[PDB]
Amino acid sequence: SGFRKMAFPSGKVEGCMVQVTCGTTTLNGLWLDDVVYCPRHVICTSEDMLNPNYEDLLIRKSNHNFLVQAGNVQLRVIGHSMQNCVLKLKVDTANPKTPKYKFVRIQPGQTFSVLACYNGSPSGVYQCAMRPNFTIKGSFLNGSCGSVGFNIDYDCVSFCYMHHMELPTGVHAGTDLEGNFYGPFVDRQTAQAAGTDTTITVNVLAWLYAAVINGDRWFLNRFTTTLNDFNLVAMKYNYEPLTQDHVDILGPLSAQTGIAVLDMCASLKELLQNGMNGRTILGSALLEDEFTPFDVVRQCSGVTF
Amino acid sequence: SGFRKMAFPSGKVEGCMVQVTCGTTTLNGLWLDDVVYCPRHVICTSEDMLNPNYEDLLIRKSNHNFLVQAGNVQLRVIGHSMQNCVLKLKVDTANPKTPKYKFVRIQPGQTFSVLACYNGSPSGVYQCAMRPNFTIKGSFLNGSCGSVGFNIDYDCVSFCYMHHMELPTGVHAGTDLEGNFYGPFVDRQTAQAAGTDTTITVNVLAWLYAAVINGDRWFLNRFTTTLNDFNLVAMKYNYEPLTQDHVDILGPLSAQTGIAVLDMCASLKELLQNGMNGRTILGSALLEDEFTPFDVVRQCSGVT
Ligand SMILES: *[C@](O)(C(N)=O)[C@H](C[C@@H]1CCNC1=O)NC(=O)[C@H](CC1CC1)n1cncc(NC(=O)OC(C)(C)C)c1=O
Numbered sequence: 001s002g003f004r005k006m007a008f009p010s011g012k013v014e015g016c017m018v019q020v021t022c023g024t025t026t027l028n029g030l031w032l033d034d035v036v037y038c039p040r041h042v043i044c045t046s047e048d049m050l051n052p053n054y055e056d057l058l059i060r061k062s063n064h065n066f067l068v069q070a071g072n073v074q075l076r077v078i079g080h081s082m083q084n085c086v087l088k089l090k091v092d093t094a095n096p097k098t099p100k101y102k103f104v105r106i107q108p109g110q111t112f113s114v115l116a117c118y119n120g121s122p123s124g125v126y127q128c129a130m131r132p133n134f135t136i137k138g139s140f141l142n143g144s145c146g147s148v149g150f151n152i153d154y155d156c157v158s159f160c161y162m163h164h165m166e167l168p169t170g171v172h173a174g175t176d177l178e179g180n181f182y183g184p185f186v187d188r189q190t191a192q193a194a195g196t197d198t199t200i201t202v203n204v205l206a207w208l209y210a211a212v213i214n215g216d217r218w219f220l221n222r223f224t225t226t227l228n229d230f231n232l233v234a235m236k237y238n239y240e241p242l243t244q245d246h247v248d249i250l251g252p253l254s255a256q257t258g259i260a261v262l263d264m265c266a267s268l269k270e271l272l273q274n275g276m277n278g279r280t281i282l283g284s285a286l287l288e289d290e291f292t293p294f295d296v297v298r299q300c301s302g303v304t305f
Numbered sequence: 306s307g308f309r310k311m312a313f314p315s316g317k318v319e320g321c322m323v324q325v326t327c328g329t330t331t332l333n334g335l336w337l338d339d340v341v342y343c344p345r346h347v348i349c350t351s352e353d354m355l356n357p358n359y360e361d362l363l364i365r366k367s368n369h370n371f372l373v374q375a376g377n378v379q380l381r382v383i384g385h386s387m388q389n390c391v392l393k394l395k396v397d398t399a400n401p402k403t404p405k406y407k408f409v410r411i412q413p414g415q416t417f418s419v420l421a422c423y424n425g426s427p428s429g430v431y432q433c434a435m436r437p438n439f440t441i442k443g444s445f446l447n448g449s450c451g452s453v454g455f456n457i458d459y460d461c462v463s464f465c466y467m468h469h470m471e472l473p474t475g476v477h478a479g480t481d482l483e484g485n486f487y488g489p490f491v492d493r494q495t496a497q498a499a500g501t502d503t504t505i506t507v508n509v510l511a512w513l514y515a516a517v518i519n520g521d522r523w524f525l526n527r528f529t530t531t532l533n534d535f536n537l538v539a540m541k542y543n544y545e546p547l548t549q550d551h552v553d554i555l556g557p558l559s560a561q562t563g564i565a566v567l568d569m570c571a572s573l574k575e576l577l578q579n580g581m582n583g584r585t586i587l588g589s590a591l592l593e594d595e596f597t598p599f600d601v602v603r604q605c606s607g608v609t
């Protein structure tokens with residue numbers, strides 16, 4: 001009973017967070033085996049950030065210019081390299097708490113947990129979606145760079161996100177763990193703006209199924225729609241096209257609740273057209289789009305790790 | 306910038322979660338030092354649940370009737386007792402992952418993180434508030450009993466909640482870690498009701514300050530109110546009365562933003578009387594009441 005924005009348990013990731021300091025700049029790193037991964041702009045002074053030449057800045061740094069602390073222990077850096085926008089620091093010690101892990105590149109619409117860290121110390125955990133415009137609506141202050149996003153996939157931590165910057169409107173951008181930005185952004189202090197954001201339609205439908213599973217039924221109606229007609233309406237509300245694959249993905253939730261996907265699309269249509277009339281769904285007055293179909297099943301079926 | 310519902314990192318609590326089984330009932334326990342804490346209804350079958358006599362059910366159990374599993378390992382139970390609605394199983398091994406901890410009883414309006422567990426294994430973490438009606442709005446399935454709620458301060462985990470039951474409205478009830486229920490609830494299969502809840506005003510004000518910190522400023526007005534006049538309106542909308550203590554705890558945010566608490570009250574009064582008129586605050590079209598003043602400062606100032 002109940003439905004909450006739910007993060008993955010963070011323990012396996014907490015045991016990988018370290019502090020990386022280069023001169024004036026301190027941010028977070030991810031310590032896996034004998035490598036520490038962090039944003040390459042740790043090597044930049046405030047001034048360098050306008051127009052950094054990263055190759056040239058890094059060739060001027062010795063291993064001694066990097067201070068890496070894991071709790072009360074200093075890790076000795078014995079090597080450094082840059083891969084895209086990530087710096088990799090080889091250290092003399094492998095992390096004894098390294099979990100089984102992979103680096104993954106996620107897709108717009110997918111969700112993940114963020115462990116917000118400052119000074120190499122975890123401060124909190126929350127759930128995020130990769131927006132259609134390749135930003136995330138995060139919560140990140142100065143010092144949070146190098147915080148990561150992850151999923152737990154069976155027996156594996158899947159790192160998908162490392163935090164680098166804030167964009168206009170107070171949304172966030174970053175890289176995968178190979179150092180490649182999500183979206184067209186660059187790691188310099190410059191005029192950058194994201195595309196118009198859109199609502200992740202398949203996720204809204206999944207959340208409406210979560211609402212039905214939790215006994216929140218007022219918005220169900222006896223109407224149906226075709227996929228084409230639904231899309232004609234939803235585009236007027238800045239919703240992403242619902243594809244036949246999305247319909248197919250929602251099949252398990254459909255079978256569980258006994259509500260056909262196109263019937264739920266007709267319910268959604270009516271909520272878009274008429275609004276909620278002062279009513280709420282699962283405690284919300286807006287339609288929520290940051291739960292995937294898989295997230296709903298996980299929560300509603302009590303999947304563990 | 307940004308503002309999200311944020312939980313504490315769960316790892317310190319993960320290392321304390323175990324599975325407790327007694328006959329055919331299995332739920333979660335909390336292993337701290339050489340004691341496992343779990344809901345006492347682990348000793349019940351469905352038939353006992355109508356009106357269980359716990360003293361007698363317990364006496365008929367022995368130590369070997371409690372199967373405690375910590376991951377792969379079975380822990381040997383060497384003693385058992387009952388404290389209010391919690392069972393305490395003494396085991397022969399102290400948990401080496403025990404964090405610094407304390408047991409606290411929280412007040413309505415205060416927030417905490419929940420680590421939802423099944424079969425002694427973590428499923429997810431989320432943030433809850435103790436409601437004025439002494440329920441929480443959680444997310445809990447069969448198997449979740451014994452999951453705990455907590456806050457972390459420095460290195461110290463303050464455990465404040467252990468999950469026991471679901472109520473008709475889809476809300477949840479439980480105890481502190483001394484086994485005392487929050488609210489008037491009891492651990493039997495009686496028909497039980499939360500009854501009407503109210504909105505945590507001091508938390509709404511904290512969240513409006515968060516909005517201002519984040520640059521959402523549209524709801525600020527030039528109106529004035531007094532604590533008396535504010536409270537008359539608040540109570541008309543089933544908001545908790547704002548007290549001087551609440552005014553005092555909002556001091557830091559008021560200072561940070563330069564907006565007096567009663568000016569923010571004048572803003573809230575307008576929102577309650579008129580609504581948001583198609584605008585949103587921090588991505589919401591409702592006034593959010595599950596962030597405390599401390600939660601806002603922590604998040605908008607980044608403590609670790
Ligand atoms: C990061 O380096 C850290 N030390 O934590 C930091 C994180 C941001 C601080 C505020 N919110 C954050 O997410 N990132 C930055 O400071 C980046 C570094 C550049 C990518 C190399 N950065 C630097 N200057 C400016 C911005 N953002 C900015 O000016 O945003 C607005 C246009 C004002 C919205 C930035 O993110």
Ligand SMILES: CC(C)(C)OC(=O)Nc1cncn([C@@H](CC2CC2)C(=O)N[C@@H](C[C@@H]2CCNC2=O)[C@H](O)C(N)=O)c1=O
Nearest residue numbers: 332346445446447448449450469470471472473492493494
């Ligand atoms: C009518 C509705 C709304 C459906 O409410 C009930 O019927 N509630 C209850 C009736 N009888 C017993 N319990 C408790 C036990 C008693 C002594 C207090 C119970 O089943 N709690 C469980 C956790 C529960 C079940 C699903 N969601 C949860 O939160 C639990 O013990 C574990 N093993 O998970 C109930 O909550």
